Design an enzyme around this catalytic site. Structure first.
Site, mmCIF file in Angstrom:
data_model
loop_
_atom_site.group_PDB
_atom_site.id
_atom_site.type_symbol
_atom_site.label_atom_id
_atom_site.label_comp_id
_atom_site.label_asym_id
_atom_site.label_seq_id
_atom_site.Cartn_x
_atom_site.Cartn_y
_atom_site.Cartn_z
ATOM 1 N N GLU A 80 0.820 -1.293 0.009
ATOM 2 C CA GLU A 80 0.079 -0.156 0.118
ATOM 3 C C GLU A 80 0.982 1.071 0.029
ATOM 4 O OE1 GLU A 80 -0.018 2.047 3.241
ATOM 5 O OE2 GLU A 80 -0.561 0.603 4.571
ATOM 6 N N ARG B 251 0.670 -2.052 12.092
ATOM 7 C CA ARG B 251 -0.200 -3.111 11.347
ATOM 8 C C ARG B 251 -0.398 -2.522 10.078
ATOM 9 N NH1 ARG B 251 -2.157 -2.846 16.023
ATOM 10 N NH2 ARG B 251 -4.259 -2.323 15.064
ATOM 11 N N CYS C 7 7.836 -1.122 -2.113
ATOM 12 C CA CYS C 7 9.101 -1.936 -2.275
ATOM 13 C C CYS C 7 9.981 -1.753 -0.991
ATOM 14 C CB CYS C 7 9.622 -1.957 -3.559
ATOM 15 S SG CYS C 7 10.350 -0.102 -4.120
ATOM 16 N N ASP D 22 11.543 -10.980 -3.436
ATOM 17 C CA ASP D 22 11.136 -9.609 -3.469
ATOM 18 C C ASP D 22 9.793 -9.818 -3.270
ATOM 19 O OD1 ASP D 22 9.891 -7.412 -4.367
ATOM 20 O OD2 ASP D 22 10.163 -7.751 -6.666
ATOM 21 N N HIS E 82 12.792 0.519 -7.643
ATOM 22 C CA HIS E 82 12.707 -0.702 -6.958
ATOM 23 C C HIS E 82 13.651 -1.214 -6.449
ATOM 24 C CE1 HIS E 82 10.259 -4.434 -6.076
ATOM 25 N NE2 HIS E 82 10.786 -4.984 -6.953
#
Length: 272
Positions: free
Chosen positions: A36, A62, A67, A124, A107
């Site tokens: 998210e 939580r 990435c 990943d 990334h």
């Protein structure tokens, strides 16, 4: 901070640096902690990639993450367990034709080894909707079937390209160098992706999680459930339902983000 993390991914679970444990950690992690970008969407940068800040957010609070947060956190975990972890940087080429412009190096993935390993593995757990949910052999040619899609690495350059068969077509996901990148270079990239006004994580909502045996992928108000023999698509009705979905299906502690009204207003503006 290890036990807290193991409880959060509900792993129960031997703890030796082996290939079996690596598979089980990756399945547990991907099953438990959503992808998210609520932080960047709400104008909150992802600027601290230390073990403490990423555990505070992805474990104690939580929340999910993107990435740098995912592979950040799992990287520190694996090192603590006795894996050797090298942090790598990559460029996302998802859906892009071969003549596309060079994407930024936005990334990060991990090259992982452990005692008695047969060669390095790619880990990943941060490439949201199409993140492999198993460690992959860091080798080219080999078709690597996971619980979901098959994956394959190919030599490109200079570096490698990760591909997966998505529905019925081989799709390049991202290209990457196997050269270790300093933590500072990762923070530069995370700053870019979390704050640049052209960033896809700034301009829209993205979330993703996995179940048995389904990918749950959210793009703005567009919910897609990708199962073995079919994809279910849902157009969420309003910003309120999007936030419910983020809490309920994605397991995200949305209250952490602030007052529900501000998240909703933001998602309505974006999104809507």
């Amino acid at each position: 901070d290890l036990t807290g993390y193991l409880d959060r991914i509900n792993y129960r679970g031997a703890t030796d640096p082996t290939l079996d444990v690596l598979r089980d950690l990756v399945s547990a992690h991907t099953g438990a902690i959503a992808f998210e970008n609520l932080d960047p969407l709400m104008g909150v940068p992802v600027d601290d990639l230390s073990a403490e800040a990423l555990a505070d957010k992805l474990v104690d609070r939580r929340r999910g993450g993107y990435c740098y947060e995912h592979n950040g956190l799992i990287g520190y975990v694996l090192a603590e367990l006795g894996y050797r972890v090298r942090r790598l940087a990559g460029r996302v080429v998802w859906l892009a034709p071969p003549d596309a412009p060079t994407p930024a190096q936005t990334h990060t993935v991990l090259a992982v080894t452990f005692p008695g390993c047969q060669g390095p593995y790619l880990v990943d757990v941060g490439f949201g909707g199409m993140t492999p949910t198993a460690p992959l052999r860091l080798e080219t040619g080999t078709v690597q079937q996971t619980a979901l899609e098959p994956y394959r690495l190919d030599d490109r350059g200079d570096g490698l390209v990760l591909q997966a068969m998505v529905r019925d077509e081989w799709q390049a996901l991202y290209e990457f160098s196997t050269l270790t990148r300093p933590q500072v270079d990762l923070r530069v990239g995370s700053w870019f992706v979390s704050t640049h006004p052209t960033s896809h994580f700034v301009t829209g909502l993205m979330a993703a999680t996995v179940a048995d045996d389904a990918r749950w992928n959210l793009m703005g108000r567009n919910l897609a459930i990708h199962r073995r023999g079919g994809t279910e698509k849902i157009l969420l009705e309003d910003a309120a339902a999007v936030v419910d979905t983020l809490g309920d299906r994605f397991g995200i502690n949305v209250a952490d983000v602030g007052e529900r009204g501000r998240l909703e207003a933001r998602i309505d503006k974006v999104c809507f």
